[PDB]
Structure 1
Amino acid sequence: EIPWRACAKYLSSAGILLLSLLVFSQLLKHMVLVAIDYWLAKWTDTVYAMVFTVLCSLGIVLCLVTSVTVEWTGLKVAKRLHRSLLNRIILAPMRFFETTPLGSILNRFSSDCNTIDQHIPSTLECLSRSTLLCVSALAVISYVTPVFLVALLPLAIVCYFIQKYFRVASRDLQQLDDTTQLPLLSHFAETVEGLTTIRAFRYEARFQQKLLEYTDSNNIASLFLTAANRWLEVRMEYIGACVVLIAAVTSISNSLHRELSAGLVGLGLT
């Protein structure tokens, strides 16, 4: 919904050819990872050796094109963003400037564009590799033991429901973190811009206490954030452990009872 649209405009800032190159790169990359090692499974029971090596080479070159595409699209998006925003902003009439407070409209160049242009590619590649290795290994453990899918289906539902639960918690949380973080910068701007007056009134201890309170507030908000994040972390981890156990048990039972090239068993369990 909203995430789809926001990410779509983000990538829209990039050329459609970047979408093609990125997607093909990720997919072919990790599908070749799966290919080469699941086909090493066929190696544990030379010709296969040499083509194994050429599969390795394909993997490495495809990783390189992948990462290069990642960095280049991040940079192109950032460039289009900063230029277009700066243009549209300076071109706004005086009604906006006199109506809107400067700190807000300023922060989007100050910290928001900073966030974008030097943290988006990191997070995007983290998410991309994570989710693609994930879905790939899911499909593969399903394949090596076709029994596993029946166990997989309810687990995915549990994941979906509890993660939507955590997200409906974390949205309110992160909003609270934002609104508890703003008065820090506000009081700092006040402190510096009216520093002479404060020294004159000799009330320094008062604003010191006020800032102590503000900082304590931000800290408690962040601790809320962390507690929530770690709770979801724990729950999802235990889901993953259950997954591992199911796969291992199913594979062992099937293989030693109904032989299936136990190399495949090791493969699924890893």
Structure 2
Amino acid sequence: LHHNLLNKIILGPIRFFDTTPLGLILNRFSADTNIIDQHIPPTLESLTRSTLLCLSAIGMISYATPVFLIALAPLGVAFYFIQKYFRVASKDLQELDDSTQLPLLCHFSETAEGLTTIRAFRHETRFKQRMLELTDTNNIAYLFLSAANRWLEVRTDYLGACIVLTASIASISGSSNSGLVGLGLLYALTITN
């Protein structure tokens, strides 16, 4: 990113740069470089490890028990759909959070910034009347964002419970050897989380 980003914008006209705003360019230089240095690599690494481990555990539990191959069609497909659902829902919620905090802090920037101009402008007490809405106007969105993550976990939790029942039936059904059933049940309990 470092060699390429600088390389792209050095050789250009002042007209466009003075026509489009500077702030967006400064943001593109700072926030995105911070994200890619700090945020994208760990996110990708964590996602790959989690995805691969979930796939590996599902694969293990299906090899160790033949019925799982048929049994595993519906539930994961539903999980696929639910995944996409969250894959958008909370995205929108994050956008909401991304803006919900912009004005309220600036308000506390303002009332303080008017250190003496609003001190005795006779509108001081009415200022709380409006302030007490913004705080709520932000914490309401906060709880909604939290709730979206919670809903995913609850749905995931019930999905995980279903898998366990299946594996348990399969284990009593399998009964190949103690090693096989032990590995299968333990890996199902692992994949639960």
The match for 2:144 among 214, 220, 224 is 224
5+ unaligned residues in a row in structure 1: which ranges?
Answer: 1-80
**Bigger relative contact order (CA 8 A; separation at least 6):** 2
| Alignment deviations for residues 78-112 of structure 1 (CA, whole Å, 9 cap, x no partner) | xxx13432443454533443333333332233333
User: Which residue type is aligned with residue 183 of structure 2?
Assistant: L
Shift of 1:160: 1.2
Structure 2 counterpart of 1:131: 51
Structure 2 counterpart of 1:50: none
The reply to whether residue 234 of structure 1 matches residue 154 of structure 2 is yes
Specify the SS of the correspondent of 1:106. Answer: helix
Structure 2 counterpart of 1:114: 34
Q: Give me the whole-angstrom Cα distance separating, in 1, the residues matched to 2:151 and 2:92.
A: 16
Shift of 1:265: 0.5
TM normalised by structure 1 equals 0.57
Q: Give me the whole-angstrom Cα distance separating, in 2, the residues matched to 1:127 and 1:176.
A: 24
Q: Evaluate the alpha carbon distance shift between residue 209 and residue 82 of structure 1 in structure 2; reply closer, same or farther with a 3 A threshold.
A: farther
Aligned-pair Cα RMSD in Å: 3.2
User: Which residue type is aligned with residue 264 of structure 1?
Assistant: L
The match for 1:140 among 38, 54, 60 is 60
5+ unaligned residues in a row in structure 2: which ranges?
Answer: 187-193
Shift of 1:249: 1.8
The match for 1:169 among 89, 104, 107 is 89
Once the two structures are superposed, the pairs formed by residues 1-270 of structure 1 within 5 Å of their partners are 81-183=1-103, 187=106, 191=110, 195=113, 198-199=114-115, 201-202=117-118, 214=134, 216-255=136-175, 260-270=176-186
| Alignment deviations for residues 23-45 of structure 1 (CA, whole Å, 9 cap, x no partner) | xxxxxxxxxxxxxxxxxxxxxxx
Percent same amino acid among aligned pairs? 66
Q: Give me the whole-angstrom Cα distance separating, in 1, the residues matched to 2:75 and 2:130.
A: 48
Shift of 1:156: 1.2
